[PDB]
Design a binder for this molecule. Structure first.
Ligand SMILES: *[C@@H]1O[C@H](CO)[C@@H](O[C@@H]2O[C@H](CO)[C@@H](O)[C@H](O)[C@H]2NC(C)=O)[C@H](O)[C@H]1NC(C)=O
Ligand SMILES: *[C@@H]1O[C@H](CO)[C@@H](O)[C@H](O)[C@H]1NC(C)=O
Ligand SMILES: *[C@@H]1O[C@H](CO)[C@@H](O)[C@H](O)[C@H]1NC(C)=O
Ligand SMILES: *[C@@H]1O[C@H](CO)[C@@H](O)[C@H](O)[C@H]1NC(C)=O
Ligand SMILES: *[C@@H]1O[C@H](CO)[C@@H](O)[C@H](O)[C@H]1NC(C)=O
Ligand SMILES: *[C@@H]1O[C@H](CO)[C@@H](O)[C@H](O)[C@H]1NC(C)=O
Ligand SMILES: COc1cc(/C=C/C(=O)O)ccc1O
Ligand SMILES: [Ca+2]
Length: 504
Protein backbone atom coordinates (compact mmCIF):
# COMPACT_ATOMS: atom_id res chain seq x y z
CA UNK A 1 0.00 0.00 0.00
CA UNK A 2 0.98 3.68 -0.58
CA UNK A 3 0.33 4.48 3.15
CA UNK A 4 2.49 1.53 4.16
CA UNK A 5 5.29 2.63 1.84
CA UNK A 6 5.10 6.09 3.46
CA UNK A 7 5.00 4.83 7.11
CA UNK A 8 7.97 2.59 6.31
CA UNK A 9 9.91 5.36 4.55
CA UNK A 10 11.64 7.03 7.50
CA UNK A 11 13.70 3.87 8.02
CA UNK A 12 14.89 3.95 4.44
CA UNK A 13 16.29 7.54 4.75
CA UNK A 14 19.94 7.81 5.68
CA UNK A 15 21.55 10.99 4.26
CA UNK A 16 24.59 12.82 5.51
CA UNK A 17 23.76 16.05 7.45
CA UNK A 18 20.03 15.42 7.01
CA UNK A 19 17.86 14.89 10.04
CA UNK A 20 14.38 13.54 9.37
CA UNK A 21 11.90 15.39 11.63
CA UNK A 22 8.94 13.24 10.58
CA UNK A 23 7.33 11.33 7.71
CA UNK A 24 3.52 11.41 7.58
CA UNK A 25 0.86 10.04 5.19
CA UNK A 26 -1.42 12.92 4.27
CA UNK A 27 -4.60 11.90 2.49
CA UNK A 28 -6.22 14.15 -0.09
CA UNK A 29 -8.67 16.52 1.57
CA UNK A 30 -6.48 17.03 4.63
CA UNK A 31 -6.26 20.64 5.93
CA UNK A 32 -2.70 20.54 7.26
CA UNK A 33 -1.99 22.42 10.42
CA UNK A 34 1.42 24.15 10.35
CA UNK A 35 1.81 25.29 14.00
CA UNK A 36 5.60 25.71 13.66
CA UNK A 37 5.44 27.99 10.61
CA UNK A 38 7.18 31.33 11.31
CA UNK A 39 4.53 33.82 12.49
CA UNK A 40 5.73 36.48 10.03
CA UNK A 41 4.93 34.11 7.13
CA UNK A 42 1.17 34.51 7.95
CA UNK A 43 0.04 30.98 7.00
CA UNK A 44 -0.67 28.31 9.60
CA UNK A 45 -2.47 25.86 7.33
CA UNK A 46 -2.57 24.30 3.88
CA UNK A 47 -5.20 22.16 2.17
CA UNK A 48 -3.67 19.20 0.45
CA UNK A 49 -6.09 18.05 -2.24
CA UNK A 50 -4.33 14.77 -3.32
CA UNK A 51 -2.63 11.96 -1.34
CA UNK A 52 1.04 12.61 -0.52
CA UNK A 53 3.80 11.21 1.63
CA UNK A 54 5.19 14.20 3.55
CA UNK A 55 8.83 14.27 4.65
CA UNK A 56 10.12 17.16 6.80
CA UNK A 57 13.80 17.62 7.45
CA UNK A 58 16.46 19.86 8.94
CA UNK A 59 19.53 19.79 6.65
CA UNK A 60 22.84 21.31 7.88
CA UNK A 61 24.40 23.38 5.10
CA UNK A 62 27.52 24.36 7.12
CA UNK A 63 28.47 24.21 10.80
CA UNK A 64 26.50 27.44 11.37
CA UNK A 65 23.57 27.11 8.96
CA UNK A 66 20.68 24.82 8.17
CA UNK A 67 17.60 24.70 6.04
CA UNK A 68 14.15 23.36 6.81
CA UNK A 69 13.20 21.16 3.85
CA UNK A 70 9.90 19.60 2.83
CA UNK A 71 9.36 16.87 0.25
CA UNK A 72 5.78 15.97 -0.83
CA UNK A 73 5.76 12.73 -2.77
CA UNK A 74 2.35 12.16 -4.41
CA UNK A 75 0.55 8.83 -4.85
CA UNK A 76 -0.55 9.86 -8.32
CA UNK A 77 3.02 10.43 -9.57
CA UNK A 78 3.98 11.38 -13.14
CA UNK A 79 7.73 10.65 -13.08
CA UNK A 80 8.59 14.38 -12.71
CA UNK A 81 10.66 16.02 -9.97
CA UNK A 82 10.11 19.71 -9.08
CA UNK A 83 11.57 22.36 -6.77
CA UNK A 84 9.78 25.44 -5.50
CA UNK A 85 11.43 28.59 -4.06
CA UNK A 86 10.91 31.61 -1.77
CA UNK A 87 9.37 35.20 -1.61
CA UNK A 88 10.83 38.54 -0.35
CA UNK A 89 13.78 38.14 2.05
CA UNK A 90 11.90 35.33 3.61
CA UNK A 91 12.38 31.89 4.60
CA UNK A 92 8.84 30.90 4.11
CA UNK A 93 8.33 27.53 2.51
CA UNK A 94 5.62 28.13 -0.05
CA UNK A 95 3.22 25.45 1.03
CA UNK A 96 0.69 26.73 -1.48
CA UNK A 97 3.15 25.82 -4.26
CA UNK A 98 3.89 22.43 -2.68
CA UNK A 99 0.10 21.70 -2.66
CA UNK A 100 -0.27 22.93 -6.22
CA UNK A 101 2.54 20.97 -7.85
CA UNK A 102 2.14 17.79 -5.77
CA UNK A 103 -1.58 17.95 -6.73
CA UNK A 104 -0.47 17.93 -10.41
CA UNK A 105 1.62 14.75 -9.85
CA UNK A 106 5.13 16.22 -9.28
CA UNK A 107 7.48 14.93 -6.59
CA UNK A 108 7.96 18.36 -5.00
CA UNK A 109 10.40 20.06 -2.62
CA UNK A 110 10.62 23.46 -0.98
CA UNK A 111 13.08 24.79 1.56
CA UNK A 112 12.93 27.83 3.85
CA UNK A 113 16.01 29.52 2.16
CA UNK A 114 18.08 29.01 5.29
CA UNK A 115 16.18 30.94 7.92
CA UNK A 116 12.76 31.47 9.42
CA UNK A 117 10.57 34.51 8.69
CA UNK A 118 10.35 37.61 6.46
CA UNK A 119 12.98 39.72 8.20
CA UNK A 120 16.57 39.97 6.89
CA UNK A 121 17.91 39.96 10.47
CA UNK A 122 18.96 36.31 10.29
CA UNK A 123 21.64 37.35 7.70
CA UNK A 124 23.19 39.62 10.32
CA UNK A 125 26.75 38.39 11.07
CA UNK A 126 25.90 35.05 9.41
CA UNK A 127 27.42 34.74 5.94
CA UNK A 128 26.49 31.01 5.66
CA UNK A 129 22.81 31.81 6.25
CA UNK A 130 23.02 34.51 3.54
CA UNK A 131 24.77 32.07 1.19
CA UNK A 132 21.84 29.63 1.67
CA UNK A 133 19.42 32.39 0.53
CA UNK A 134 21.61 33.37 -2.46
CA UNK A 135 22.13 29.87 -3.95
CA UNK A 136 22.71 26.95 -1.58
CA UNK A 137 19.20 26.39 -0.10
CA UNK A 138 17.49 25.73 -3.42
CA UNK A 139 20.36 23.60 -4.69
CA UNK A 140 20.52 21.54 -1.49
CA UNK A 141 16.77 20.80 -1.74
CA UNK A 142 17.25 19.70 -5.34
CA UNK A 143 20.09 17.29 -4.43
CA UNK A 144 18.21 15.80 -1.43
CA UNK A 145 14.83 15.87 -3.19
CA UNK A 146 16.14 13.92 -6.20
CA UNK A 147 17.68 11.36 -3.76
CA UNK A 148 14.36 10.95 -1.91
CA UNK A 149 12.40 10.67 -5.19
CA UNK A 150 14.66 7.86 -6.45
CA UNK A 151 14.47 6.11 -3.04
CA UNK A 152 10.72 6.23 -2.90
CA UNK A 153 9.75 5.41 -6.51
CA UNK A 154 11.17 2.44 -8.42
CA UNK A 155 10.86 4.46 -11.64
CA UNK A 156 12.91 7.42 -10.25
CA UNK A 157 12.28 10.64 -12.30
CA UNK A 158 12.60 11.30 -16.01
CA UNK A 159 12.81 15.11 -15.91
CA UNK A 160 13.39 17.87 -13.40
CA UNK A 161 11.48 21.16 -13.14
CA UNK A 162 11.60 24.47 -11.21
CA UNK A 163 8.62 26.72 -10.34
CA UNK A 164 9.04 30.09 -8.56
CA UNK A 165 8.24 33.81 -8.73
CA UNK A 166 9.73 37.03 -7.18
CA UNK A 167 12.73 35.90 -5.05
CA UNK A 168 11.68 32.55 -6.49
CA UNK A 169 12.16 33.94 -10.02
CA UNK A 170 15.67 34.98 -9.01
CA UNK A 171 16.35 31.54 -7.63
CA UNK A 172 15.22 30.00 -10.95
CA UNK A 173 17.77 32.19 -12.75
CA UNK A 174 20.48 31.44 -10.18
CA UNK A 175 19.85 27.79 -11.11
CA UNK A 176 20.14 28.56 -14.88
CA UNK A 177 23.28 30.61 -14.35
CA UNK A 178 25.16 28.54 -11.66
CA UNK A 179 23.63 25.02 -11.67
CA UNK A 180 22.80 24.39 -15.36
CA UNK A 181 22.24 20.69 -14.71
CA UNK A 182 19.78 21.03 -11.77
CA UNK A 183 16.70 21.39 -14.01
CA UNK A 184 15.53 20.37 -17.46
CA UNK A 185 12.84 23.10 -17.39
CA UNK A 186 12.75 26.29 -15.36
CA UNK A 187 9.65 28.46 -14.89
CA UNK A 188 10.75 31.79 -13.36
CA UNK A 189 8.31 34.64 -12.77
CA UNK A 190 8.94 38.40 -12.12
CA UNK A 191 12.47 37.68 -11.12
CA UNK A 192 14.29 39.51 -8.34
CA UNK A 193 17.55 39.29 -10.29
CA UNK A 194 19.71 42.43 -10.53
CA UNK A 195 18.94 41.96 -6.85
CA UNK A 196 21.36 44.43 -5.23
CA UNK A 197 20.19 47.17 -7.56
CA UNK A 198 16.56 46.16 -6.95
CA UNK A 199 17.17 46.91 -3.24
CA UNK A 200 18.76 50.26 -4.09
CA UNK A 201 15.88 51.16 -6.42
CA UNK A 202 13.34 50.07 -3.77
CA UNK A 203 15.14 52.29 -1.22
CA UNK A 204 15.32 55.35 -3.59
CA UNK A 205 11.50 55.76 -3.68
CA UNK A 206 11.60 57.27 -0.16
CA UNK A 207 14.23 59.82 -1.25
CA UNK A 208 11.87 60.91 -4.01
CA UNK A 209 8.50 61.04 -2.09
CA UNK A 210 9.75 62.06 1.32
CA UNK A 211 7.57 61.26 4.34
CA UNK A 212 3.77 61.30 4.56
CA UNK A 213 2.65 64.92 4.61
CA UNK A 214 5.76 66.46 2.98
CA UNK A 215 5.73 68.72 -0.16
CA UNK A 216 7.04 65.92 -2.36
CA UNK A 217 4.64 63.17 -1.21
CA UNK A 218 1.37 62.02 -2.81
CA UNK A 219 -1.54 60.44 -0.91
CA UNK A 220 -3.27 57.25 -2.15
CA UNK A 221 -6.10 59.44 -3.47
CA UNK A 222 -3.60 61.45 -5.55
CA UNK A 223 -2.01 58.17 -6.82
CA UNK A 224 -5.50 57.14 -7.93
CA UNK A 225 -5.94 60.48 -9.75
CA UNK A 226 -2.50 59.93 -11.28
CA UNK A 227 -3.43 56.35 -12.34
CA UNK A 228 -6.58 57.55 -14.11
CA UNK A 229 -4.62 60.19 -16.04
CA UNK A 230 -1.98 57.59 -17.00
CA UNK A 231 -4.79 55.46 -18.46
CA UNK A 232 -6.25 58.50 -20.28
CA UNK A 233 -2.81 59.02 -21.87
CA UNK A 234 -1.84 55.38 -22.45
CA UNK A 235 -4.74 52.83 -22.28
CA UNK A 236 -5.73 53.33 -25.92
CA UNK A 237 -2.24 53.08 -27.46
CA UNK A 238 -2.76 49.26 -27.81
CA UNK A 239 -6.12 49.93 -29.59
CA UNK A 240 -8.41 48.82 -26.78
CA UNK A 241 -9.87 51.11 -24.11
CA UNK A 242 -10.06 48.45 -21.47
CA UNK A 243 -8.34 50.01 -18.47
CA UNK A 244 -5.10 48.04 -19.30
CA UNK A 245 -1.75 49.15 -20.81
CA UNK A 246 -0.90 46.16 -23.02
CA UNK A 247 2.76 47.20 -23.35
CA UNK A 248 3.76 50.06 -21.10
CA UNK A 249 7.10 50.48 -22.92
CA UNK A 250 5.09 52.71 -25.28
CA UNK A 251 3.67 54.71 -22.34
CA UNK A 252 5.71 57.80 -21.46
CA UNK A 253 3.25 59.78 -19.50
CA UNK A 254 3.31 63.54 -19.07
CA UNK A 255 1.87 64.36 -15.63
CA UNK A 256 2.30 68.10 -15.73
CA UNK A 257 -1.15 67.79 -17.47
CA UNK A 258 -2.81 67.37 -14.02
CA UNK A 259 -1.07 70.15 -12.13
CA UNK A 260 -3.78 72.15 -10.25
CA UNK A 261 -5.39 75.05 -12.12
CA UNK A 262 -6.59 78.10 -10.19
CA UNK A 263 -9.97 77.20 -8.66
CA UNK A 264 -9.40 73.42 -8.92
CA UNK A 265 -10.11 71.19 -5.92
CA UNK A 266 -6.63 70.40 -4.41
CA UNK A 267 -7.69 66.79 -3.85
CA UNK A 268 -7.99 66.10 -7.57
CA UNK A 269 -4.71 67.44 -8.92
CA UNK A 270 -0.96 67.74 -8.26
CA UNK A 271 1.26 70.58 -7.23
CA UNK A 272 4.35 71.17 -9.35
CA UNK A 273 6.44 69.42 -6.75
CA UNK A 274 4.18 66.41 -6.83
CA UNK A 275 4.35 66.31 -10.65
CA UNK A 276 8.20 66.34 -10.30
CA UNK A 277 7.90 63.42 -7.88
CA UNK A 278 5.88 61.44 -10.38
CA UNK A 279 8.25 62.27 -13.32
CA UNK A 280 11.19 60.92 -11.19
CA UNK A 281 9.25 57.81 -10.16
CA UNK A 282 8.95 56.92 -13.88
CA UNK A 283 12.67 57.53 -14.36
CA UNK A 284 15.46 55.02 -13.98
CA UNK A 285 17.98 54.79 -11.11
CA UNK A 286 21.50 55.77 -12.13
CA UNK A 287 24.53 55.44 -9.85
CA UNK A 288 27.80 57.22 -9.13
CA UNK A 289 29.67 57.62 -12.43
CA UNK A 290 26.37 57.91 -14.34
CA UNK A 291 25.84 54.21 -14.98
CA UNK A 292 22.42 52.54 -15.04
CA UNK A 293 21.47 50.54 -11.95
CA UNK A 294 17.75 49.79 -12.40
CA UNK A 295 15.20 50.84 -15.00
CA UNK A 296 12.06 52.89 -14.35
CA UNK A 297 8.89 51.63 -12.65
CA UNK A 298 6.55 50.89 -15.55
CA UNK A 299 3.42 53.04 -15.58
CA UNK A 300 0.13 51.38 -14.59
CA UNK A 301 1.03 49.85 -11.21
CA UNK A 302 0.08 52.91 -9.17
CA UNK A 303 -2.78 51.68 -6.96
CA UNK A 304 -0.89 48.82 -5.28
CA UNK A 305 2.49 50.65 -5.57
CA UNK A 306 1.14 53.66 -3.56
CA UNK A 307 0.67 51.28 -0.60
CA UNK A 308 3.99 49.39 -0.87
CA UNK A 309 6.56 51.64 -2.58
CA UNK A 310 5.26 55.19 -2.37
CA UNK A 311 3.77 55.04 1.17
CA UNK A 312 6.21 57.55 2.66
CA UNK A 313 8.28 54.98 4.60
CA UNK A 314 11.58 53.39 3.57
CA UNK A 315 10.89 50.09 1.89
CA UNK A 316 11.51 47.46 4.58
CA UNK A 317 13.39 44.73 2.63
CA UNK A 318 15.99 47.21 1.42
CA UNK A 319 16.34 48.81 4.84
CA UNK A 320 17.01 45.34 6.21
CA UNK A 321 19.50 44.63 3.37
CA UNK A 322 21.47 47.80 4.11
CA UNK A 323 21.36 47.42 7.95
CA UNK A 324 22.12 43.74 8.33
CA UNK A 325 24.38 42.99 5.33
CA UNK A 326 25.76 46.08 3.66
CA UNK A 327 26.68 48.12 6.74
CA UNK A 328 26.11 45.71 9.71
CA UNK A 329 24.47 48.48 11.71
CA UNK A 330 20.85 47.78 12.79
CA UNK A 331 20.39 51.52 13.42
CA UNK A 332 21.41 52.58 9.89
CA UNK A 333 18.97 55.34 8.85
CA UNK A 334 17.24 54.28 5.63
CA UNK A 335 15.72 57.76 5.18
CA UNK A 336 19.18 58.96 4.23
CA UNK A 337 19.84 56.36 1.48
CA UNK A 338 21.99 57.88 -1.32
CA UNK A 339 23.61 56.57 -4.53
CA UNK A 340 26.95 56.33 -2.68
CA UNK A 341 25.30 53.55 -0.58
CA UNK A 342 24.18 51.87 -3.83
CA UNK A 343 27.81 51.80 -5.04
CA UNK A 344 28.99 50.16 -1.80
CA UNK A 345 26.22 47.55 -2.01
CA UNK A 346 26.81 46.73 -5.67
CA UNK A 347 30.58 46.30 -5.14
CA UNK A 348 29.94 44.00 -2.15
CA UNK A 349 27.53 41.76 -4.19
CA UNK A 350 27.71 38.91 -1.68
CA UNK A 351 27.90 35.42 -3.23
CA UNK A 352 26.84 37.04 -6.49
CA UNK A 353 23.32 37.64 -5.20
CA UNK A 354 23.01 40.00 -8.21
CA UNK A 355 22.15 36.83 -10.19
CA UNK A 356 22.76 38.95 -13.28
CA UNK A 357 25.14 36.76 -15.42
CA UNK A 358 23.93 37.33 -19.03
CA UNK A 359 25.95 34.49 -20.58
CA UNK A 360 23.70 31.44 -20.06
CA UNK A 361 25.38 29.24 -22.72
CA UNK A 362 26.13 26.52 -20.14
CA UNK A 363 22.36 26.16 -19.55
CA UNK A 364 21.70 26.10 -23.30
CA UNK A 365 24.49 23.49 -23.76
CA UNK A 366 23.10 21.28 -21.03
CA UNK A 367 19.77 21.11 -22.99
CA UNK A 368 17.72 23.18 -20.47
CA UNK A 369 14.66 25.32 -21.30
CA UNK A 370 13.69 28.44 -19.33
CA UNK A 371 10.34 30.19 -19.53
CA UNK A 372 10.11 33.53 -17.74
CA UNK A 373 7.06 35.85 -17.49
CA UNK A 374 6.51 39.26 -15.90
CA UNK A 375 3.29 41.17 -15.17
CA UNK A 376 3.15 44.54 -16.86
CA UNK A 377 1.51 46.33 -13.90
CA UNK A 378 3.98 44.95 -11.35
CA UNK A 379 4.05 47.13 -8.18
CA UNK A 380 7.19 45.48 -6.59
CA UNK A 381 9.62 44.53 -9.38
CA UNK A 382 9.48 46.58 -12.60
CA UNK A 383 8.73 44.55 -15.71
CA UNK A 384 11.33 46.72 -17.48
CA UNK A 385 14.08 44.93 -15.56
CA UNK A 386 13.17 41.64 -17.26
CA UNK A 387 13.32 43.47 -20.61
CA UNK A 388 16.79 44.75 -19.69
CA UNK A 389 17.96 41.26 -18.83
CA UNK A 390 16.73 40.02 -22.24
CA UNK A 391 18.74 42.71 -24.11
CA UNK A 392 21.81 41.89 -22.06
CA UNK A 393 21.55 38.12 -22.79
CA UNK A 394 21.15 38.78 -26.57
CA UNK A 395 24.04 41.23 -26.61
CA UNK A 396 26.37 39.09 -24.53
CA UNK A 397 25.56 35.80 -26.20
CA UNK A 398 25.73 37.61 -29.60
CA UNK A 399 22.44 36.13 -30.89
CA UNK A 400 18.96 37.45 -31.90
CA UNK A 401 15.58 36.41 -30.50
CA UNK A 402 15.18 33.52 -33.01
CA UNK A 403 18.23 31.83 -31.53
CA UNK A 404 17.33 32.60 -27.85
CA UNK A 405 13.85 31.12 -28.62
CA UNK A 406 15.44 27.66 -28.69
CA UNK A 407 16.09 27.67 -24.93
CA UNK A 408 14.91 31.00 -23.34
CA UNK A 409 11.45 32.50 -23.87
CA UNK A 410 10.08 35.58 -22.03
CA UNK A 411 6.36 36.39 -22.03
CA UNK A 412 5.07 39.82 -21.04
CA UNK A 413 1.72 39.51 -19.29
CA UNK A 414 -0.77 42.39 -19.66
CA UNK A 415 -2.87 43.30 -16.64
CA UNK A 416 -0.88 41.22 -14.20
CA UNK A 417 0.48 42.64 -10.95
CA UNK A 418 3.37 41.07 -8.97
CA UNK A 419 3.25 37.30 -9.53
CA UNK A 420 -0.62 37.23 -9.32
CA UNK A 421 -3.63 39.61 -9.34
CA UNK A 422 -4.08 42.71 -11.49
CA UNK A 423 -6.73 44.28 -13.72
CA UNK A 424 -6.54 41.88 -16.65
CA UNK A 425 -5.88 38.32 -17.80
CA UNK A 426 -3.38 37.21 -15.14
CA UNK A 427 -4.69 33.64 -14.87
CA UNK A 428 -1.73 31.78 -16.45
CA UNK A 429 -1.43 28.93 -13.97
CA UNK A 430 1.90 29.84 -12.37
CA UNK A 431 0.24 29.23 -8.97
CA UNK A 432 -3.08 27.90 -7.57
CA UNK A 433 -4.22 31.50 -7.17
CA UNK A 434 -3.79 32.02 -10.98
CA UNK A 435 -5.09 28.62 -12.07
CA UNK A 436 -7.28 28.14 -15.14
CA UNK A 437 -7.11 24.31 -15.45
CA UNK A 438 -4.13 21.92 -15.92
CA UNK A 439 -3.94 21.68 -19.70
CA UNK A 440 -0.76 23.12 -21.32
CA UNK A 441 -2.75 25.67 -23.37
CA UNK A 442 -3.95 27.36 -20.14
CA UNK A 443 -1.08 26.56 -17.71
CA UNK A 444 2.56 27.82 -17.90
CA UNK A 445 3.96 25.00 -15.80
CA UNK A 446 2.38 22.30 -17.93
CA UNK A 447 3.44 24.24 -21.04
CA UNK A 448 7.09 23.83 -19.89
CA UNK A 449 6.49 20.15 -19.38
CA UNK A 450 5.25 19.97 -22.98
CA UNK A 451 8.26 21.95 -24.28
CA UNK A 452 10.73 19.71 -22.44
CA UNK A 453 9.04 16.32 -22.98
CA UNK A 454 7.46 16.78 -26.48
CA UNK A 455 9.71 19.48 -27.98
CA UNK A 456 6.69 21.83 -28.39
CA UNK A 457 7.77 25.39 -27.51
CA UNK A 458 5.17 27.89 -26.40
CA UNK A 459 4.42 30.62 -28.95
CA UNK A 460 2.15 32.61 -26.62
CA UNK A 461 0.96 32.08 -23.03
CA UNK A 462 -2.79 32.24 -22.41
CA UNK A 463 -4.21 33.90 -19.32
CA UNK A 464 -7.73 34.24 -17.90
CA UNK A 465 -9.40 37.29 -16.48
CA UNK A 466 -11.73 35.99 -13.77
CA UNK A 467 -15.12 37.46 -12.82
CA UNK A 468 -14.20 37.03 -9.09
CA UNK A 469 -10.84 35.14 -8.68
CA UNK A 470 -9.65 31.64 -9.65
CA UNK A 471 -12.55 29.19 -9.57
CA UNK A 472 -15.08 31.84 -10.72
CA UNK A 473 -16.31 32.07 -14.27
CA UNK A 474 -13.70 33.13 -16.78
CA UNK A 475 -14.75 36.47 -18.22
CA UNK A 476 -12.23 36.45 -21.04
CA UNK A 477 -8.85 35.08 -22.04
CA UNK A 478 -5.86 36.57 -23.88
CA UNK A 479 -2.78 35.04 -25.51
CA UNK A 480 0.12 37.01 -24.09
CA UNK A 481 3.01 37.63 -26.45
CA UNK A 482 6.59 36.35 -26.55
CA UNK A 483 9.09 39.22 -26.14
CA UNK A 484 10.07 41.22 -28.09
CA UNK A 485 6.50 41.07 -29.47
CA UNK A 486 3.60 43.09 -28.03
CA UNK A 487 -0.17 42.62 -28.19
CA UNK A 488 -2.35 44.97 -30.32
CA UNK A 489 -6.12 44.92 -30.57
CA UNK A 490 -7.06 44.64 -34.30
CA UNK A 491 -10.57 43.12 -34.23
CA UNK A 492 -12.82 41.96 -35.62
CA UNK A 493 -14.87 41.31 -32.53
CA UNK A 494 -14.66 42.93 -29.15
CA UNK A 495 -11.42 43.13 -27.09
CA UNK A 496 -12.70 40.23 -24.94
CA UNK A 497 -12.14 37.91 -27.89
CA UNK A 498 -8.59 36.57 -27.75
CA UNK A 499 -8.78 36.16 -31.58
CA UNK A 500 -9.19 39.97 -31.95
CA UNK A 501 -5.58 40.57 -30.82
CA UNK A 502 -2.31 39.99 -32.65
CA UNK A 503 1.26 39.79 -31.34
CA UNK A 504 3.26 42.24 -33.35
C1 LIG B 1 12.27 27.05 11.35
O1 LIG B 1 10.89 26.68 11.22
C2 LIG B 1 10.66 25.27 11.09
C3 LIG B 1 9.17 25.03 10.87
O2 LIG B 1 8.73 25.38 9.55
C4 LIG B 1 11.21 24.52 12.32
O3 LIG B 1 11.15 23.10 12.14
C5 LIG B 1 10.44 22.42 13.23
O4 LIG B 1 11.23 22.38 14.45
C6 LIG B 1 10.81 21.50 15.52
C7 LIG B 1 11.85 21.65 16.65
O5 LIG B 1 13.10 21.09 16.25
C8 LIG B 1 10.61 20.06 14.99
O6 LIG B 1 10.29 19.12 16.05
C9 LIG B 1 9.54 20.10 13.86
O7 LIG B 1 9.31 18.81 13.31
C10 LIG B 1 9.97 21.02 12.72
N1 LIG B 1 8.96 21.19 11.64
C11 LIG B 1 9.27 20.98 10.33
C12 LIG B 1 8.28 21.43 9.28
O8 LIG B 1 10.36 20.48 10.02
C13 LIG B 1 12.66 24.87 12.51
O9 LIG B 1 13.08 24.39 13.77
C14 LIG B 1 12.90 26.35 12.54
N2 LIG B 1 14.34 26.57 12.51
C15 LIG B 1 15.07 27.06 13.50
C16 LIG B 1 14.37 27.53 14.73
O10 LIG B 1 16.29 27.10 13.36
C1 LIG C 1 -8.22 25.12 6.53
O1 LIG C 1 -8.06 25.55 7.90
C2 LIG C 1 -7.99 26.96 8.16
C3 LIG C 1 -8.06 27.14 9.66
O2 LIG C 1 -6.89 26.47 10.12
C4 LIG C 1 -9.09 27.74 7.49
O3 LIG C 1 -8.82 29.13 7.66
C5 LIG C 1 -9.15 27.38 6.01
O4 LIG C 1 -10.24 28.09 5.40
C6 LIG C 1 -9.36 25.86 5.87
N1 LIG C 1 -9.58 25.54 4.46
C7 LIG C 1 -10.62 24.80 4.02
C8 LIG C 1 -10.93 24.95 2.55
O5 LIG C 1 -11.32 24.09 4.76
C1 LIG D 1 32.89 25.97 10.25
O1 LIG D 1 32.72 26.10 8.85
C2 LIG D 1 33.55 27.10 8.30
C3 LIG D 1 32.93 27.51 6.96
O2 LIG D 1 32.81 26.39 6.06
C4 LIG D 1 34.94 26.45 8.37
O3 LIG D 1 35.94 27.25 7.74
C5 LIG D 1 35.33 26.25 9.85
O4 LIG D 1 36.51 25.46 9.92
C6 LIG D 1 34.29 25.47 10.64
N1 LIG D 1 34.42 25.56 12.10
C7 LIG D 1 34.07 24.53 12.91
C8 LIG D 1 33.87 24.82 14.39
O5 LIG D 1 33.84 23.38 12.49
C1 LIG E 1 -8.22 53.63 -5.79
O1 LIG E 1 -8.78 52.87 -6.86
C2 LIG E 1 -8.94 51.48 -6.57
C3 LIG E 1 -9.45 50.74 -7.81
O2 LIG E 1 -8.41 50.74 -8.79
C4 LIG E 1 -9.93 51.35 -5.44
O3 LIG E 1 -10.23 49.99 -5.15
C5 LIG E 1 -9.32 51.98 -4.21
O4 LIG E 1 -10.24 51.90 -3.11
C6 LIG E 1 -8.95 53.44 -4.47
N1 LIG E 1 -8.11 53.90 -3.36
C7 LIG E 1 -8.39 55.00 -2.68
C8 LIG E 1 -7.44 55.33 -1.56
O5 LIG E 1 -9.37 55.68 -2.97
C1 LIG F 1 -12.85 68.95 -2.66
O1 LIG F 1 -12.96 67.51 -2.72
C2 LIG F 1 -13.41 66.82 -1.56
C3 LIG F 1 -13.48 65.34 -1.94
O2 LIG F 1 -12.11 64.88 -2.07
C4 LIG F 1 -14.72 67.44 -1.06
O3 LIG F 1 -15.08 66.78 0.16
C5 LIG F 1 -14.55 68.96 -0.80
O4 LIG F 1 -15.81 69.55 -0.47
C6 LIG F 1 -14.07 69.67 -2.05
N1 LIG F 1 -13.80 71.08 -1.78
C7 LIG F 1 -14.20 72.12 -2.58
C8 LIG F 1 -13.77 73.50 -2.14
O5 LIG F 1 -14.82 72.00 -3.66
C1 LIG G 1 -16.82 44.97 -25.20
O1 LIG G 1 -16.87 44.26 -23.96
C2 LIG G 1 -16.71 45.10 -22.82
C3 LIG G 1 -16.66 44.18 -21.60
O2 LIG G 1 -17.97 44.02 -21.06
C4 LIG G 1 -17.78 46.21 -22.79
O3 LIG G 1 -17.31 47.26 -21.93
C5 LIG G 1 -18.04 46.85 -24.17
O4 LIG G 1 -19.30 47.53 -24.15
C6 LIG G 1 -18.08 45.84 -25.31
N1 LIG G 1 -18.22 46.55 -26.60
C7 LIG G 1 -19.25 46.37 -27.46
C8 LIG G 1 -19.21 47.16 -28.75
O5 LIG G 1 -20.16 45.59 -27.23
C1 LIG H 1 27.09 43.69 -14.65
O1 LIG H 1 27.90 43.93 -15.81
C2 LIG H 1 27.37 44.23 -17.05
C3 LIG H 1 26.39 45.17 -17.22
C4 LIG H 1 25.91 45.39 -18.50
C5 LIG H 1 24.91 46.41 -18.53
C6 LIG H 1 24.42 47.01 -19.60
C7 LIG H 1 23.50 48.04 -19.10
O2 LIG H 1 23.36 48.01 -17.83
O3 LIG H 1 22.99 48.90 -19.87
C8 LIG H 1 26.36 44.79 -19.66
C9 LIG H 1 27.36 43.85 -19.53
C10 LIG H 1 27.87 43.56 -18.26
O4 LIG H 1 28.87 42.66 -18.12
CA1 LIG I 1 -5.60 49.03 -23.46
Amino acid sequence: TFQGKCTGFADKINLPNVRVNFVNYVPGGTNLSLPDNPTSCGTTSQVVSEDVCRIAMAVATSNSSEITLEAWLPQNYTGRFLSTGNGGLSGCIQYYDLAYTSGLGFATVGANSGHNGTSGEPFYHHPEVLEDFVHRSVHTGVVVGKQLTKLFYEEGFKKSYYLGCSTGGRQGFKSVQKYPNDFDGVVAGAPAFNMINLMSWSAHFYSITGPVGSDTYLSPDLWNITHKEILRQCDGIDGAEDGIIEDPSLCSPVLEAIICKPGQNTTECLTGKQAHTVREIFSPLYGVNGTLLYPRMQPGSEVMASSIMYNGQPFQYSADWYRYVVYENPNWDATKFSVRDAAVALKQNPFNLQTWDADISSFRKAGGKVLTYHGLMDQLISSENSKLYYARVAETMNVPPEELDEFYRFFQISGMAHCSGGDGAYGIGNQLVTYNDANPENNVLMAMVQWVEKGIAPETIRGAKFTNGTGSAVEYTRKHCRYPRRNVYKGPGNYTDENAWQCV
